[PDB]
């Protein structure tokens, strides 16, 4: 990629591409088609998984017919479904209560290595530590 036009990243539903309240028309209305988002998005989404937030950016200029593109999951929410307590803090960040695993935080970042500058695979992990310690999440490391 060398040039981007615009993007509205929102956490939308992999199971079925048709939410009324969450986004509905707000997903794309400025040249975007809500009819092209249930005929192609679910085309590639049966090939990995459905159910969790899958952000999507849409390529609409003025020709009415875009080229949907994928995205990658969030890393701060990766410690909610894969690490421990979902929320992360529970209380205001004054007292450390959270925790993480030691074998994890190494493979749970290799999935999202397609958006990490740190060349080395482990230099990608070192960044996770900051992500994982957002509130001070104390690894029994």
């Amino acid at each position: 990629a060398k040039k981007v036009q615009a993007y509205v990243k929102l956490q939308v539903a992999a199971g079925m591409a048709n939410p009324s309240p969450p986004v509905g028309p707000a997903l794309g209305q400025q040249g975007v088609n809500i009819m092209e988002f249930c005929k192609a998005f679910n085309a590639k989404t049966d090939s990995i998984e459905k159910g969790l937030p899958i952000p999507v950016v849409i390529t609409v200029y003025a020709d009415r017919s875009f080229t949907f593109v994928t995205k990658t999951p969030p890393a701060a929410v990766l410690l909610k479904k894969a690490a421990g307590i979902k929320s992360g803090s529970g209380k205001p960040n004054k007292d450390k209560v959270g925790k993480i695993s030691r074998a994890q935080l190494q493979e749970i970042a290799q999935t999202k290595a397609a958006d990490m500058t740190g060349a080395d695979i482990e230099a990608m992990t070192r960044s996770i530590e900051g992500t994982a310690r957002s509130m001070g999440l104390v690894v029994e490391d």
């Binding site: 990629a1 060398k2 500058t117 060349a119």
Partner: protein, 148 residues
């Protein structure tokens, strides 16, 4: 800019490259972006790993500060921006060709390939440094020139 014990580090590394370097080109990143340097990063990774370093230094006392020792022609490659692509163990193997290709993708510019000082010339995109190891193109005609 801390005082002087910081910039001199830049001059040290740059002089180490220019003197202990090889054939290299320029890359004029007037409006550098994320992905242009990322492709340059992969390209440098191909050359034996990380020695095709490319830092954003067009600055006289910073990049032009190592010219006097080696590459004593960088005053004219001292202007608005020259992200000199200094080399290291090896040769020209594909540095110029790869630049010549990646700049022609509209990647920002290379100031019309201002060029480094391997030769006694200034700007000449050459393709005469791709092949430096091949020793098998000479064993292709041995089993077809015996019968006749």
């Amino acid at each position: 800019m801390a005082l002087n014990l910081q910039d001199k580090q830049a001059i040290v590394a740059e002089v180490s490259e220019v003197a202990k370097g090889a054939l290299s080109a320029v890359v004029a990143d007037s409006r550098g972006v994320t992905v242009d340097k990322m492709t340059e990063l992969r390209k440098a990774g191909r050359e034996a790993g990380v020695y095709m370093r490319v830092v954003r230094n067009t600055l006289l006392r910073r990049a032009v500060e190592g010219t006097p020792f080696e590459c004593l022609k960088d005053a004219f490659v001292g202007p608005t921006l020259i992200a000199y692509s200094m080399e290291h163990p090896g040769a020209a193997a594909r540095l110029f060709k790869e630049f010549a290709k990646a700049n022609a993708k509209f990647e920002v510019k290379a100031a019309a390939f201002e060029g480094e000082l391997i030769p006694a010339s200034q700007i000449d995109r050459l393709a005469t440094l791709p092949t430096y190891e091949e020793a098998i193109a000479r064993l292709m005609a041995t089993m077809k020139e015996a019968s006749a």
